[PDB]
Amino acid sequence: ETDKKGENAPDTKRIKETLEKFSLENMRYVGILKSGQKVSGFIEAEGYVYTVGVGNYLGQNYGRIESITDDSIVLNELIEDSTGNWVSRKAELLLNSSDKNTEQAAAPAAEQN
C-alpha cells in the first residue's frame, strides 16, 4: 500500500525543480512574458531562464510570486531563520535594466580650453 499526502514528516536531500540547484543571489529579473491577457515575470538563474506569474514558484529556497507589474515583481521568499523554520519574506524586485549612472566626472587629464 502506498499513500500520497503531506503530513508532518521530514524531507530528503532530493530536489523539486532544476531551480533548486540555483541560489537567489543568482536569480535576477530579465524581463516578462505574455500569458493570454496578462504579464508574467521572467526571471533567470545563472543562465537558466524560467518565467513566473500570479501565484508561481521562484527563487532558491521557497519563493512564491503573487504580484507582477511592468519592470517589477512582488514575491514572498521563504527561508530558515532564528525561528528555526523557513519564514516567509515578502519582497518586490525591480527590473535591473540598463539604467546605470555613468555620468561624466573629474578624471586624470588636462584640457585645452
In DSSP terms, 63 is beta-bridged to 58, 77
- All structural domains of the chain with their residue ranges: 17-96
Distance CA 55, CA 92 (A): 14
User: Kindly report the CA angle at 92 between 87 and 93, in degrees rounded to 5?
Assistant: 115
What was the experiment behind these coordinates? NMR
> Across the chain, how many H-helices and E-strands are there?
0, 7
At 99, list the grid cell.
539604467
Place of cell 531562464: 49
- Would you say 74 and 65 are in contact if contact means Cβ atoms under 8 Å apart? yes
Assigned fold of 17-96: SH3 type barrels. (2.30.30)
